[PDB]
Design a binder for this molecule. Structure first.
Ligand SMILES: N[C@H]1CC[C@H](Nc2nc(Nc3cccc(C(F)(F)F)c3)c3c(=O)[nH]ccc3n2)CC1
Lengths: 5, 274
């Protein structure tokens, strides 16, 4: 996964 | 009167920062972004020359706004009963670095070098103006797709730059340094440098290196993508566990990996234009 914070 | 001088377009996004709309300045059709911040949701307040209480963000953006920059400009602001409204510059066409990375994956080193260099120039600019960003990350960077210029956004977690310790932080945990995680203490510059190392890993690998406290504390960096030794070295240097083992901005910019940077437009022509 490659995800927002 | 806020409503008459701007025309609101669609919601661009919302989150910890509040809500941001595309907009247009009615008088000259200048593309703008319109950001609404709720008063109850503002933790940190400042005050202007005149002395009235505004969001720290407004103070910070005013301190970095004069002249030109890789910092998004504050054009105007308004107070409302329960919120503040900020009018900000909006490049067109534009994409944030997070989405850009999502779409294109790991960036070529040449492109990452140009981008990273511009981030560094923008952060030096902030520091030079007495402003600490405290939330440097791909989500907080905009790409002007035509000129190939990066712009820093979202100063809402920022602070006045100081030389003493900070014991408060409300930026992004995965970009925050081990000294924050362990002791709840950091110095501005060396913490900024850590987050820059996270950012650079993100650019050249397509994702951040750490998701967990344990990994941050450990500070061991593994590469999933082919990445040059000079780039790996720069990254591991920025991510030194001891703050005083991290490079200064000068050392970063004099690093062998940082040699022969492309100009913004060259960057857009080679990597951004279709
Ligand atoms: N996932 C999104 C969430 C909203 C975020 N906010 C944003 N987006 C902005 N611009 C913008 C305009 C059109 C499209 C996009 C895009 F495609 F979301 F990156 C961003 C601006 C801006 O132009 N000026 C000042 C602030 C600003 N903030 C950009 C990334």
């Amino acid at each position: 996964k490659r995800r927002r914070h | 009167p806020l409503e008459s001088q701007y025309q609101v377009g669609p919601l661009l996004g919302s989150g910890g920062f509040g809500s941001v709309y595309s907009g247009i300045r009615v008088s000259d059709n200048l593309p703008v972004a319109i950001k609404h911040v709720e008063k109850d949701r503002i933790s940190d307040w400042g005050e202007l020359p005149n002395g009235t209480r505004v969001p720290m963000e407004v103070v910070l953006l005013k301190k970095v706004s004069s002249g030109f920059s890789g910092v998004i400009r504050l054009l105007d602001w308004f107070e409302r009963p329960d919120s503040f409204v900020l009018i900000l510059e909006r490049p067109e066409p534009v994409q944030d670095l997070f989405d850009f990375i999502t779409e294109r994956g790991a960036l070529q080193e040449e492109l990452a070098r140009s981008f990273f260099w511009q981030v560094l120039e923008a952060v030096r600019h902030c520091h030079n103006c007495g402003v600490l960003h405290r939330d440097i990350k791909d989500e907080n960077i905009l790409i002007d797709l035509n000129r190939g210029e990066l712009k820093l956004i979202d100063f809402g977690s920022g602070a006045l730059l100081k030389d003493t310790v900070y014991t408060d932080f409300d930026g992004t945990r995965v970009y925050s340094p081990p000294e924050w995680i362990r002791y709840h203490r950091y110095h501005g510059r060396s913490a900024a440098v850590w987050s820059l190392g996270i950012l650079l890993y993100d650019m050249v690998c397509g994702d951040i290196p750490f998701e967990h406290d344990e990994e941050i504390i450990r500070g061991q960096v593994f590469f999933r993508q082919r990445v040059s030794s000079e780039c790996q070295h720069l990254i591991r240097w920025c991510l030194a566990l001891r703050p005083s083992d991290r490079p200064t901005f000068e050392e970063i910019q004099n690093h062998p990996w940082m040699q022969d940077v492309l100009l913004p437009q060259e960057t857009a022509e080679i990597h951004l234009h279709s």
